[PDB]
XYZ file of C-alpha atoms in Angstrom:
157
model
C -10.380 0.772 13.064
C -9.116 -1.226 16.115
C -12.006 -2.179 18.186
C -12.703 -3.865 21.588
C -15.717 -5.563 23.336
C -15.897 -6.113 27.053
C -18.172 -8.843 28.234
C -18.468 -7.625 31.783
C -20.633 -5.022 33.253
C -18.891 -4.730 36.833
C -15.516 -5.219 38.202
C -14.639 -6.805 41.670
C -11.838 -8.010 43.781
C -10.069 -10.399 43.921
C -8.613 -13.259 41.623
C -5.700 -15.776 42.254
C -3.392 -17.517 39.813
C -1.379 -20.450 40.685
C -0.704 -21.820 37.215
C -4.161 -22.613 35.749
C -5.154 -20.755 32.436
C -8.359 -18.573 32.412
C -10.379 -19.757 29.652
C -13.580 -18.861 27.782
C -15.088 -19.966 24.517
C -16.688 -17.695 22.118
C -17.993 -17.413 18.500
C -18.646 -14.540 16.359
C -21.526 -13.798 13.781
C -19.149 -12.121 11.454
C -15.273 -12.556 10.434
C -12.894 -10.728 12.404
C -9.062 -10.708 13.250
C -8.288 -10.900 16.712
C -5.061 -9.074 17.646
C -5.328 -9.434 21.539
C -6.983 -9.510 24.673
C -7.518 -7.050 27.442
C -6.849 -8.414 30.839
C -7.697 -7.340 34.225
C -4.531 -6.351 36.439
C -3.355 -6.383 39.835
C -5.090 -5.209 43.021
C -1.804 -3.274 44.294
C 0.885 -1.841 42.238
C 3.061 -1.360 40.825
C 3.616 -4.813 39.611
C 3.531 -6.808 36.454
C 2.824 -10.413 34.992
C 4.003 -12.877 32.694
C 1.172 -13.829 30.760
C 0.592 -16.678 27.913
C -2.237 -15.868 25.767
C -3.836 -18.383 23.273
C -6.589 -18.791 20.906
C -7.508 -22.204 19.860
C -9.771 -23.922 17.503
C -12.328 -25.612 19.942
C -13.557 -28.752 17.996
C -9.843 -29.942 17.341
C -8.126 -28.295 20.281
C -5.611 -26.924 17.757
C -3.795 -23.577 18.677
C -4.240 -20.819 15.920
C -2.315 -18.334 17.732
C -0.052 -17.896 20.924
C 2.257 -15.522 22.634
C 4.263 -15.618 25.868
C 4.318 -12.133 26.710
C 3.625 -9.917 29.810
C 2.045 -6.431 31.069
C 2.700 -4.093 33.875
C 0.082 -2.477 35.950
C -0.948 0.240 38.497
C -3.704 -1.404 40.755
C -6.627 0.194 38.888
C -9.824 -1.724 37.889
C -8.946 -0.893 34.239
C -8.016 -3.604 31.553
C -4.554 -3.948 29.964
C -3.784 -5.013 26.522
C -1.609 -7.934 25.750
C -1.077 -8.631 21.954
C -0.606 -11.601 19.913
C 2.531 -11.754 17.551
C -0.037 -11.626 14.563
C -3.882 -11.298 13.889
C -5.765 -14.545 14.151
C -8.389 -14.778 11.674
C -11.926 -15.695 13.320
C -14.456 -17.332 11.037
C -18.073 -16.880 11.472
C -20.192 -19.111 13.870
C -16.935 -21.336 14.793
C -16.245 -21.901 18.225
C -12.902 -20.791 19.646
C -11.270 -20.816 22.883
C -9.426 -17.824 24.476
C -6.627 -18.535 27.065
C -4.908 -16.395 29.244
C -2.411 -17.832 31.816
C -1.260 -15.193 34.146
C 1.605 -15.619 36.486
C 1.515 -12.675 38.920
C -0.270 -11.354 41.876
C -3.964 -11.156 42.563
C -5.987 -9.092 40.212
C -9.357 -7.541 39.703
C -12.093 -9.559 37.816
C -15.135 -8.879 35.997
C -18.940 -9.747 37.011
C -22.300 -9.624 35.620
C -20.612 -10.995 32.578
C -23.014 -11.088 29.377
C -23.818 -14.167 27.121
C -24.031 -12.102 24.019
C -22.489 -8.626 23.455
C -22.542 -6.731 20.168
C -20.154 -4.329 18.400
C -21.755 -1.967 15.821
C -19.824 0.104 13.444
C -21.022 3.716 13.790
C -20.284 4.298 9.942
C -22.281 1.386 8.381
C -24.330 0.167 11.431
C -22.939 -3.380 10.805
C -23.232 -5.578 13.985
C -20.508 -8.015 15.040
C -22.183 -10.141 17.817
C -19.900 -12.074 20.171
C -21.442 -15.033 22.070
C -19.441 -16.498 25.081
C -19.623 -19.897 26.378
C -18.306 -21.671 29.407
C -15.017 -23.401 28.867
C -15.327 -26.335 31.418
C -12.288 -27.314 33.548
C -8.809 -25.841 33.414
C -10.272 -22.351 33.433
C -8.974 -20.736 36.785
C -12.742 -20.317 37.644
C -13.586 -18.096 34.717
C -17.088 -18.125 33.317
C -19.599 -16.466 31.240
C -20.595 -14.469 34.245
C -17.365 -13.803 36.024
C -13.456 -13.828 35.788
C -10.701 -12.972 33.528
C -10.552 -12.183 29.803
C -12.769 -9.254 29.776
C -11.706 -7.793 26.469
C -11.124 -9.275 22.928
C -9.246 -6.574 20.656
C -10.016 -7.126 17.039
C -10.534 -5.601 13.505
C -13.781 -6.194 11.590
C -13.546 -7.369 7.998
């Protein structure tokens, strides 16, 4: 029942980390539990990252979930799972801010990013539509069209 959605259609190189969080805002049209993100990994390997991930309620800038964690990686253009300590419940049509601060070597990054991207249950046809929006400032250059945080890993309700 663990799902994921990737908002990028293509993968390029390379993206650098110097201490600034990659951030993207999103809202969902249906209630979900986010359990983590998929993040792009290094250009060369083997190597790894420390990574701090967070989900913040946008309107108040209050943290709902946060985890200082890590992942290791091989140089592929694939995405790597980094998990929150517990599920964060995301309510319909509330704006949330996803943060990942990677500390590590240069990575791949996503291109041709999508504003809207829909997950559809193969069992019921129920649609879970994600809308992504630009997180202005303090985002390591990440946007709706390019950058980090390709994937949200979640369960539907």
